[PDB]
Symmetry: D2
Subunit: 231 residues, 4 copies
């Protein structure tokens, strides 16, 4: 199927498919079962920020999630993306809900990639009704307050369960190329995860996939709209 | 048909369709008959550089073409692109040949656009065999020495007449949006125009069009792959 | 004395020294008597934004001042800065008060300059207690809420009259150099002008000066901390 | 004395002060005795490129040196710069010669730093006769062919032994600040190390120091103009 490398912000622990007993951030390499995780003290109702970075020198993929005036969670995983992903990929954001729900509102998102001396950079400090440079999939919608809502949110502002949505940047990104000395990318997005129930689910993720990636069927809930199964 | 705003580097004067009696650079607003031109001392065989810029404050579109150790040609034209182009556009390079020919080799190309924020930036300091973020049209080919050849070039390196090709960046660009204080873009490309014959033709152009723009039929020669007619 | 090119946001009209009968923005070229002005509907108590831009192609200096949900004021003036300013300059913000006062709080400030390719860029989305890359002059202070206060503000938050202060970026900026095809800069700052009295004064200005520029004596009030006299 | 963090490109091995038996690149943390080194196949007469990077997420300082069509050398070292360097620093390039010599020509140099936001970026694709934003120390000179010569070179283009020179960017750089989630910098320079003799010396280095750093006395040769001794 698709080849997926993602940084997940997993709000709901699915101990049955290998998740730790608490909300966590993790690094997924072609599997929803994080290669590396870290505890994450999710703050329902507050706007968070996630910074992801990778560079060909270290070949280490790192992420840092933080809320203002609170400690951050950080997770890093050694991975050579040339052996994982194909040269050209698409980058995006994904999110799901299941029995439990939460809003998966993205307030902004940026990305920069350099293959050294080619570069790509985009920034969305706001989202429009018809964001033509975003390929929306699933329940994802834009213009919803100038925000990007990855999963279903009803008029009253409430999140719906069993929802899945993604947003991919329109242009393919040349993630690697052997003749390059330094290949690198970084991404950043602010989000607003808010759930009326005691247990929010399921999470948000930044991912890099094959250019023709699409939401696997049934990947609501714990699969975060990324994987076809829990393998 | 398409809505075209372009900066042309016209190597061959077509006095019959309004061109001055010498190679020139010009500003085309929905017409191949430049709204404003400037004499251009084209240097056959040498790599040139073109810088184009527009900003919503001045609403002036300027371009500057130069060769090392030589003077530069400059042309500017007052235009409010909100009344000319649609909000979302695609940006690209185009080129043609006719009876007379020349190579229309692009060695690099970059573009940056900002709608104040929201930004887009790309840089091609080299072109690969399959540049997936470029939509090639006509005789345009990549990987041809790490270069982008807009028009036909045979094995021996010779240009072919009656050729037309374009290259558009894959993602749509939000060129304007009323709620913005400052909308602006700039582009830069280096090129290599070389022709074995005494009179090279026909030229190169940076253009901004409707997202679904394609080479008008028969637009080889003097139409620079931009316009359906000489109106 | 000093060579000054500035974009002023004049909150108090000094009809005696050539000011129009209303708050206005203007372009000052070695004179406090604006070469070009434009009416400005200053909003006491609200955070404004100013965008300034210049490029060697047009040789036009433009500025745009705006408040959210309000129309903007724009002023442009044709000027070849190579004949006005020296190659190397320093850039900064300045402000004053006289009989009447107002807070001249700068909340952020950025600048980018390119001589093409050499470039300089800095951004202050916040100011620290000891901002070592800023040369503060006069009553200017930093750390004052993470903000830069150009003129005196007392504990209770009230502005003091007869105050003058400036803030210059530490490094000299190569504003021009004949061997360059395109020389250009742009600057942006957000401010908070608030005055308890019915008539706020005197204004804020972005300026470019000789590297060793300092506040002329007595330049409080209408001289905006830029000029030694009203000539 | 000064606090120094540098990435050295050591062309001459000093086995007596802890150097491996071959030219190497290394990471120096307040000591000329590299915390981590890597073999470097220096190419006399060819222009090389060095990329250095650090980010607060990984807290790993990496460097990659490469010559076209040749393998690159890479060295990384885990270090938390908040415990090593002071908040505000100056960044620069340094170089020396001793009994043996070589040219230490820098053809270009760029640097970018971000504390998140707040940012600093500069680029020198060429150096002028009087580069006012560069603080030159020792035998360092600019305008020397549009290049920056860190150590003595004589009209005929020959390098002189026992030479030492540095070039620091004029403005202080806010390297760290506790209230920041992500602090990071990167630097890049191309160089031309050419020596007429059989055993070139001594090397070039990118360094970060206390703002008031200056070449320690006698630091020619193996001390690379960075350290007062070999401890
Ligand atoms: C029958 O229980 C199984 O399904 C429960 C609901 O599953 C769906 O809803 C959850 C939350 O909205 C979502 O994450 C899933 O992907 C589905 O969309 C689920 O709650 C339950 O898990 C619970 O029990 C297991 C062990 O059985 C634990 O590992 C979990 O952490 C929960 O305690 C299970 O999947
Ligand atoms: C018979 O001459 C007419 O056609 C000539 C060839 O035209 C083709 O080639 C040119 C150049 O490659 C291309 O631009 C055209 O679109 C065709 O593909 C052409 O050379 C010629 O132009 C010249 O003659 C007219 C009339 O004097 C002048 O106005 C021009 O300046 C040229 O001198 C003409 O169109
Ligand atoms: C009539 O008094 C003169 O001086 C007044 C005080 O000037 C000082 O304070 C103002 C306001 O802060 C400042 O701009 C000056 O530089 C001094 O620091 C001044 O208020 C007054 O100006 C007003 O009156 C004249 C004539 O009526 C008008 O031309 C102006 O527009 C003002 O209405 C005057 O210069
Ligand atoms: C007297 O020998 C000692 O100094 C020699 C010269 O030192 C000067 O020159 C070198 C290179 O230009 C420079 O790095 C020094 O700082 C001085 O400027 C030096 O050659 C010699 O070293 C010898 O021993 C070491 C063993 O570690 C070898 O690596 C060297 O190649 C020499 O064999 C010594 O320090
Ligand atoms: Ca889960
Ligand atoms: Ca023509
Ligand atoms: Ca005034
Ligand atoms: Ca050595
Ligand atoms: Mn998980
Ligand atoms: Mn023409
Ligand atoms: Mn005025
Ligand atoms: Mn060493």
């Amino acid at each position: 199927a698709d080849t997926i490398v993602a940084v997940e912000l997993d709000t709901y622990p699915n101990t049955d498919i290998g998740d730790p007993s608490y909300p966590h951030i993790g690094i997924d390499i072609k599997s929803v079962r994080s290669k590396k995780t870290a505890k994450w003290n999710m703050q329902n109702g507050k706007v968070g920020t996630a910074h992801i970075i990778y560079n060909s020198v270290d070949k280490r993929l790192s992420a840092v999630v933080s809320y203002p005036n609170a400690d951050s969670a950080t997770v890093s995983y050694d991975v050579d993306l040339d052996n994982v992903l194909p040269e050209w990929v698409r980058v995006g954001l994904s999110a799901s809900t299941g029995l439990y729900k939460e809003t998966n509102t993205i307030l902004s998102w940026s990305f920069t990639s350099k293959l050294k001396t080619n570069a790509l950079h985009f920034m969305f400090n706001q989202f429009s009704k018809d964001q033509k440079d975003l390929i929306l999939q699933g329940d994802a919608t834009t213009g919803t307050d100038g925000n990007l809502e990855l999963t279903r949110v009803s008029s009253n502002g409430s999140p719906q369960g069993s929802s899945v949505g993604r947003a991919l940047f329109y242009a393919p990104v040349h993630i690697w190329e052997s003749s390059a000395v330094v290949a690198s990318f970084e991404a950043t997005f602010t989000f607003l995860i808010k759930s009326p129930d005691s247990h929010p689910a399921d999470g948000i993720a930044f991912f890099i996939s094959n250019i023709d990636s699409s939401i696997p069927s049934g990947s609501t809930g714990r699969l975060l709209g990324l994987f076809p199964d829990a393998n």
